[PDB]
Amino acid sequence: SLGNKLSITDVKAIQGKKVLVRVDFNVPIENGVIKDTNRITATLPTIHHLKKEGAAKIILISHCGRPDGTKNLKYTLKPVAETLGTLLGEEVLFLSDCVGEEVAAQINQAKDNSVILLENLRFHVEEEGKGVDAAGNKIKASKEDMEKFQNELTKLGDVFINDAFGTAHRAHSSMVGIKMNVKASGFLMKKELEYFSKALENPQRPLLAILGGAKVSDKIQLIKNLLDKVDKMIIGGGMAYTFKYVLNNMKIGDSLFDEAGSKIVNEIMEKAKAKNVEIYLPVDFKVADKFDNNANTKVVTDEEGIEDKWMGLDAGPKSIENYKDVILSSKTIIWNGPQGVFEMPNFAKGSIECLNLVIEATKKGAISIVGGGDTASLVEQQQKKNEISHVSTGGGASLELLEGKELPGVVALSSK
Numbered sequence: 001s002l003g004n005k006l007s008i009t010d011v012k013a014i015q016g017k018k019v020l021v022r023v024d025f026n027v028p029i030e031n032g033v034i035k036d037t038n039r040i041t042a043t044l045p046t047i048h049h050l051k052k053e054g055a056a057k058i059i060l061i062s063h064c065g066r067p068d069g070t071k072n073l074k075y076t077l078k079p080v081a082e083t084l085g086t087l088l089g090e091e092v093l094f095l096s097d098c099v100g101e102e103v104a105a106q107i108n109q110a111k112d113n114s115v116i117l118l119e120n121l122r123f124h125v126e127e128e129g130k131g132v133d134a135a136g137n138k139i140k141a142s143k144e145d146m147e148k149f150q151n152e153l154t155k156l157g158d159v160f161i162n163d164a165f166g167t168a169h170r171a172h173s174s175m176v177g178i179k180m181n182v183k184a185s186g187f188l189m190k191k192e193l194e195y196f197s198k199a200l201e202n203p204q205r206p207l208l209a210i211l212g213g214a215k216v217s218d219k220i221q222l223i224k225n226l227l228d229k230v231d232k233m234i235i236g237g238g239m240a241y242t243f244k245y246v247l248n249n250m251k252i253g254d255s256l257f258d259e260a261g262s263k264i265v266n267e268i269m270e271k272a273k274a275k276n277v278e279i280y281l282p283v284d285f286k287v288a289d290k291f292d293n294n295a296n297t298k299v300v301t302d303e304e305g306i307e308d309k310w311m312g313l314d315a316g317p318k319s320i321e322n323y324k325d326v327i328l329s330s331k332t333i334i335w336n337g338p339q340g341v342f343e344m345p346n347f348a349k350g351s352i353e354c355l356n357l358v359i360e361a362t363k364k365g366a367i368s369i370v371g372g373g374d375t376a377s378l379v380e381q382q383q384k385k386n387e388i389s390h391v392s393t394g395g396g397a398s399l400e401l402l403e404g405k406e407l408p409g410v411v412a413l414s415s416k
């Protein structure tokens with residue numbers, strides 16, 4: 001279950017407690033300078049809530065870069081402590097390690113109600129469970145090593161707040177080994193769980209999945225899992241040409257073709273029929289004579305097909321008109337994939353109309369969730385993030401969740 005997890009807002013006893021908070025501070029750092037502070041800014045509602053509620057100590061644990069289980073100062077979290085301090089308007093204590101008596105002494109000696117950032121968790125092979133030493137030899141933590149490290153992290157505080165949904169798909173020590181009585185989601189994790197639970201667990205129906213992207217192969221697990229949940233599914237973008245070729249022997253010219261994924265198309269269609277799911281593939285396409293925004297273009301239907309040396313780059317006008325009834329009649333929408341080469345403005349029309357229809361359905365009461373990177377990029381480029389119910393920032397964890405995979409960091413939270 002996703003929606004029955006204890007959240008930071010449910011936690012009554014915070015005043016005077018040492019609160020351990022797992023955060024996502026995996027930010028790009030160039031010569032000690034943080035190039036993108038968004039992940040740090042995103043944690044401010046969690047930190048402020050714990051400050052306002054009077055926690056004795058706010059102890060932040062995280063990782064960044066690729067230390068691979070040994071201390072590698074290239075991936076030190078020291079600059080993050082400086083940046084966070086500036087954003088909070090107070091000094092953030094930075095510690096050289098994340099476990100041990102010295103760390104415990106420094107935390108206890110620190111000013112009441114203050115924020116402490118401990119060193120990169122992944123400097124310890126026990127965080128990921130395996131790594132590579134400096135020489136390049138594979139290293140592995142034994143069961144006992146793992147248990148010791150997790151007991152050392154548990155000893156840091158009294159209450160655990162997991163605000164790193166982006167790592168919750170990993171069975172890592174800070175995700176599954178912090179055995180405090182209260183283990184609750186932070187504000188970021190809380191919103192991720194609340195909206196994915198709304199979408200996948202007893203949703204307001206019809207439930208629609210809008211899938212898109214270049215290939216079929218990397219989306220097989222996602223499609224098959226969503227066919228167990230949804231009422232309707234739009235399949236678009238570059239992956240649609242493989243479907244058109246297999247199902248209708250449509251000529252696709254030089255359009256993308258997924259050789260390995262083509263072998264699975266019938267299984268997917270057979271599963272949608274078995275699950276009583278309505279599939280909506282495009283029936284026309286905007287075709288180009290070159291892979292370029294300034295190519296000569298025209299619209300071709302799925303009956304005409306695509307001539308040799310031409311390529312389909314976006315859904316056609318009839319396909320776009322077909323989105324209206326499908327999207328506007330849906331009460332829950334999970335969108336994971338643009339419907340064309342949106343990076344090229346002339347091939348963005350299908351994805352933009354899809355976005356406008358999703359916004360309209362949301363305004364009328366539908367719950368809209370945007371899953372991954374490219375769709376999130378389109379929403380950001382169009383400046384419409386405030387018009388979608390939830391735009392996930394979970395990256396790999398969001399994709400695993402939608403594929404129906406177990407999220408060990410979510411499983412490890414306390415129940416409500």
Ligand SMILES: O=C1N[C@H](c2ccc([N+](=O)[O-])o2)Nc2sc3c(c21)CCCC3
Binds near residue numbers: 237312313
């Ligand atoms: O790299 C490519 N991706 C695009 C793509 C992604 C999504 C869609 N869509 O049509 O929606 O098409 N389509 C083609 S043709 C093509 C390429 C791509 C590479 C060079 C040869 C011709």
